[PDB]
Design a protein around this motif. Sequence first.
Motif, short mmCIF file in Angstrom:
data_model
loop_
_atom_site.label_atom_id
_atom_site.label_comp_id
_atom_site.label_asym_id
_atom_site.label_seq_id
_atom_site.Cartn_x
_atom_site.Cartn_y
_atom_site.Cartn_z
N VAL A 81 9.10 9.14 -0.11
CA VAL A 81 8.08 9.10 0.93
C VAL A 81 7.87 10.45 1.63
O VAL A 81 6.73 10.86 1.84
N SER A 114 15.24 3.13 5.03
CA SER A 114 16.45 3.08 4.22
C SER A 114 16.30 2.33 2.90
O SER A 114 17.31 2.13 2.23
N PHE A 129 4.80 0.28 -0.87
CA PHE A 129 4.06 0.64 -2.06
C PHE A 129 4.67 0.04 -3.37
O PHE A 129 5.06 0.77 -4.30
N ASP A 130 4.73 -1.31 -3.42
CA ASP A 130 5.29 -2.07 -4.56
C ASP A 130 4.94 -3.53 -4.37
O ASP A 130 5.47 -4.17 -3.45
N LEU A 150 7.98 -5.96 -4.56
CA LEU A 150 8.83 -5.96 -3.35
C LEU A 150 8.11 -6.59 -2.20
O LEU A 150 8.69 -7.43 -1.48
N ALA A 173 6.04 12.91 -0.45
CA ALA A 173 4.65 12.48 -0.60
C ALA A 173 3.82 12.76 0.64
O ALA A 173 2.72 13.32 0.56
N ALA A 176 10.16 8.84 6.54
CA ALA A 176 11.52 8.45 6.22
C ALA A 176 12.24 9.76 5.93
O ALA A 176 12.41 10.17 4.77
N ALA A 204 3.80 -0.26 5.52
CA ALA A 204 3.17 -0.06 4.20
C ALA A 204 4.31 0.00 3.18
O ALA A 204 5.18 0.86 3.30
N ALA A 259 0.84 -1.21 0.00
CA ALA A 259 0.00 0.00 0.00
C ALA A 259 0.86 1.24 0.00
O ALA A 259 2.01 1.18 0.44
C1 LIG Z 1 6.65 8.55 -3.93
C2 LIG Z 1 5.18 8.54 -3.67
N1 LIG Z 1 4.38 9.43 -4.25
N2 LIG Z 1 3.15 9.17 -3.73
C3 LIG Z 1 2.04 10.05 -4.06
C4 LIG Z 1 3.15 8.15 -2.86
C5 LIG Z 1 4.45 7.71 -2.77
C6 LIG Z 1 4.91 6.58 -1.96
C7 LIG Z 1 6.09 5.89 -2.05
C8 LIG Z 1 6.06 4.88 -1.03
C9 LIG Z 1 6.88 3.80 -0.60
N3 LIG Z 1 8.02 3.49 -1.27
C10 LIG Z 1 9.06 2.58 -0.80
C11 LIG Z 1 10.17 3.30 -0.05
C12 LIG Z 1 10.51 2.92 1.25
C13 LIG Z 1 11.45 3.63 1.97
C14 LIG Z 1 12.11 4.74 1.43
C15 LIG Z 1 11.77 5.11 0.12
C16 LIG Z 1 10.82 4.40 -0.61
S1 LIG Z 1 12.46 6.49 -0.66
O1 LIG Z 1 11.52 7.57 -0.60
O2 LIG Z 1 12.95 6.09 -1.96
C17 LIG Z 1 13.83 6.87 0.37
C18 LIG Z 1 13.39 6.87 1.82
C19 LIG Z 1 13.17 5.43 2.25
C20 LIG Z 1 9.61 1.75 -1.98
C21 LIG Z 1 10.73 0.82 -1.54
C22 LIG Z 1 8.50 0.96 -2.67
N4 LIG Z 1 6.50 3.02 0.43
C23 LIG Z 1 5.31 3.29 1.00
N5 LIG Z 1 4.43 4.24 0.68
C24 LIG Z 1 4.85 5.02 -0.34
N6 LIG Z 1 4.16 6.07 -0.90
#
Ligand SMILES: Cc1nn(C)cc1-c1cc2c(N[C@H](c3ccc4c(c3)S(=O)(=O)CCC4)C(C)C)ncnc2[nH]1
Length: 168
Positions: A47, A126, A154-155, A158, A50, A36, A152, A19
């Motif tokens: 994150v 991270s 969002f993939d 993963l 967002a 984060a 949560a 999610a």
């Molecule tokens: C962007 C975005 N735009 N909108 C509108 C929603 C989102 C959104 C992204 C997201 C998410 N992403 C994960 C993630 C987990 C941790 C970190 C990052 C990314 S990061 O921002 O790259 C660096 C900091 C650490 C991925 C691994 C799938 N996990 C949950 N919810 C999320 N929501």
Amino acid sequence: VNSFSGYLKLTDNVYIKNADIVEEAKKVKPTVVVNAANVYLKHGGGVAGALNKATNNAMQVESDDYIATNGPLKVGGSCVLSGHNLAKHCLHVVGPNVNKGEDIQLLKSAYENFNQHEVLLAPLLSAGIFGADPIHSLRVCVDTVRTNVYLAVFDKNLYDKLVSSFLE
Ligand SMILES: Cc1nn(C)cc1-c1cc2c(N[C@H](c3ccc4c(c3)S(=O)(=O)CCC4)C(C)C)ncnc2[nH]1
């Protein structure tokens, strides 16, 4: 209150769902949503950007006032600020960014901050462009967090590799 739905319980205190953490926060309005964050609380992308955008920049204005008075956080540290429209509180947690050379031992210190809150909605620290191995981040969360954390991720791809590593 904390009406989390559709999570899969991995351990006594760790749950996971495929999610968007922003959509989960808008639905649930949990007592605590974890951001984060980075040490100067500048929510520019990923994150943090967002979550900030879903508060319409109220998170960034408040974060700027916290930094002015208290100075930056350290890698592995945190602060509690308002959750605005997304939650009662936002726990801004700084995990190490291995893509920018920060040390992986600090990921345990980052997760330790969750232990001051009984229930939290959180992202996988991270992971993404911070560069840590996401399955390793899940193992640190499981070994470190003792309070009730709802992750949560969002993939779906993963999410399925995390659940596959954890259960099989
Ligand atoms: C962007 C975005 N735009 N909108 C509108 C929603 C989102 C959104 C992204 C997201 C998410 N992403 C994960 C993630 C987990 C941790 C970190 C990052 C990314 S990061 O921002 O790259 C660096 C900091 C650490 C991925 C691994 C799938 N996990 C949950 N919810 C999320 N929501």
